Amino acid sequence: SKVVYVSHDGTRRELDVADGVSLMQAAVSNGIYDIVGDCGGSASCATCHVYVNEAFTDKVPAANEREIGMLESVTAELKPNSRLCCQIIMTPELDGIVVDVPDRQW
Ligand code: FES
């Protein structure tokens, strides 16, 4: 399914992500440099921060307690639609999901 990573300067980068693969994993393994994913996807860092387009925030499973806690430490502006994309697993329903990436993770 399709996923669009919009870098902070507006560049739209589309990737085909297989079901069950997290947005972070697909990102860091396909040149999406503005996403670090340092902890490896256990909601243990804030380096996979992204802003989920409001047309998809409802279809994504809500952030668990751990992510909520980690999000508090994001280095870029924390917004209502901020999410640690390693916590978002790709599924067909999410096809076309768009995420805007901040100008910094560290
Ligand atoms: S890769 Fe560390 S919280 Fe997402």
Side-chain angles (χ1 to χ4, degrees):
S1 305
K2 292 310 162 47
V3 182
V4 182
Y5 300 80
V6 184
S7 99
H8 178 77
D9 73 340
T11 307
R12 293 175 69 83
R13 299 154 298 179
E14 175 185 8
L15 296 184
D16 191 305
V17 178
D19 303 351
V21 174
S22 86
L23 296 188
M24 179 283 275
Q25 189 174 306
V28 301
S29 77
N30 284 295
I32 308 302
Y33 65 76
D34 35 347
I35 287 175
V36 187
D38 192 52
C39 82
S42 63
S44 298
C45 74
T47 68
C48 67
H49 182 200
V50 303
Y51 304 111
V52 179
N53 183 281
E54 289 296 353
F56 302 83
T57 50
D58 56 310
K59 300 186 237 286
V60 176
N64 61 39
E65 205 51 45
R66 197 172 175 70
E67 169 173 21
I68 288 297
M70 210 59 26
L71 280 177
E72 285 308 316
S73 66
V74 292
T75 58
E77 191 192 329
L78 177 63
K79 303 185 179 184
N81 58 336
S82 291
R83 292 297 302 275
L84 300 186
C85 74
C86 68
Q87 297 295 290
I88 300 175
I89 305 306
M90 196 56 177
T91 67
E93 344 269 74
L94 300 179
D95 178 72
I97 181 173
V98 177
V99 305
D100 285 72
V101 187
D103 58 347
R104 66 177 294 182
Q105 292 295 338
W106 293 109

